Design an enzyme around this catalytic site. Structure first.
Site: not given
Length: 330
Positions: A199, A35
């Site tokens: 992004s 994770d």
């Protein structure tokens, strides 16, 4: 040193991925959920409340000659999906794919919430976010990666998750045969303890690319792709019959649909998520309403590039002094 381990979807939907991890001496192999959105290595154990164990493999520290109780240490964690666990702490030897760390904090669960109990395939979590998020008190502990880093050939690990197929976590090297083209690297902020990056935009299907900054985290422990409501609405508007359902808890679409791809930007590069990766199947057994793999982050407080996004790429988690993230197509 290096390590290399195969990671395997837990079910036919790729709801999560498990990777075998050797703990203790002799080794006890548990299948952990790696994770990158958390920083605790915790396991089901001989100390876990018996009614809260249902099929998981447990770590029994009394059977490990290298286990030592970390005196006075406790831990307690709550995840974004509302699940939680807590317990005490041992140090022990932990190996992943041939890479061994001695003295790793292994957090032994005394209590786990229902969603953990109900998932027989996940024996615990191995956190790979920054150690500043580790919950051990009163002395915070380091992640497996942080402990291994100095010994690694290069201070990196990579995630290569499969679509409906196994994939690989590598530590200490970049497998140049595992991706196509080049890896594009992008800046990371560690201010919230995550692999947080920006992004450069998105496209839906064959549509034009929208240049827009989207701050979010690369999180292998989250199944879906959670993005701003504007982006998500633009995606699902291209699917006839798709709608946001408050009763189901997100966007659903007719199972008869063919889904468009979704592209996200990494600098000037582009990662394409095929439409099929966005299908999470019937909302309930036999239903013709299917659950979407792209969902709104509104009210999460953060955008999350979870498995839906990451599995479309070869992803480098570069833990150099100034961390960065790399993405390549594959």
């Amino acid at each position: 040193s290096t390590g290399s381990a195969t990671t395997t979807p837990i079910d036919s939907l790729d709801d999560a991925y498990i990777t075998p991890v050797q703990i203790g001496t002799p080794a006890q192999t548990l299948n952990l959920d790696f994770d990158t959105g958390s920083s605790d290595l915790w396991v089901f154990s001989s100390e876990t409340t018996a009614s809260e164990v249902d099929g998981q493999t447990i770590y029994t520290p009394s059977k490990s000659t290298t286990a030592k109780l970390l005196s006075g240490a406790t831990w307690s964690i709550s995840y974004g999906d509302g699940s939680s666990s807590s317990g005490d702490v041992y140090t022990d030897t932990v190996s992943v794919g041939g890479l061994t760390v001695t003295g790793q904090a292994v957090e032994s669960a005394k209590k786990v919430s229902s969603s953990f109990t109900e998932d027989s395939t996940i024996d615990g979590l191995l956190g790979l976010a920054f150690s500043t998020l580790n919950t051990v008190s009163p002395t915070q502990q380091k992640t497996f990666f942080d402990n291994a880093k100095a010994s690694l050939d290069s201070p990196v690990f990579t995630a290569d998750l499969g679509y409906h197929a196994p994939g690989t976590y590598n530590f200490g090297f970049i497998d140049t045969t595992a991706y196509t083209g080049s890896i594009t690297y992008t800046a990371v902020s560690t201010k919230q303890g995550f692999w947080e990056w920006t992004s450069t935009g998105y496209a839906v299907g064959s549509g034009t690319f929208k240049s827009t900054s989207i701050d979010g985290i690369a999180d292998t422990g989250t199944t879906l792709l959670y993005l701003p409501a504007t982006v998500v609405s633009a995606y699902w508007a291209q699917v006839s019959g798709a709608k946001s359902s408050s009763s189901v808890g997100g966007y659903v679409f007719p199972c008869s649909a063919t889904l468009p791809s979704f592209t996200f930007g990494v600098g000037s590069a582009r990662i394409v998520i095929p439409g099929d990766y966005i299908d999470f199947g019937p909302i309930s057994t036999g239903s013709s309403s299917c659950f979407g793999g792209i969902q709104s982050s509104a009210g999460i407080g953060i955008n999350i590039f979870g498995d839906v996004a990451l599995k479309a790429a070869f992803v480098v988690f570069n833990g150099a002094t100034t961390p960065t993230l790399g993405f390549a197509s594959k």
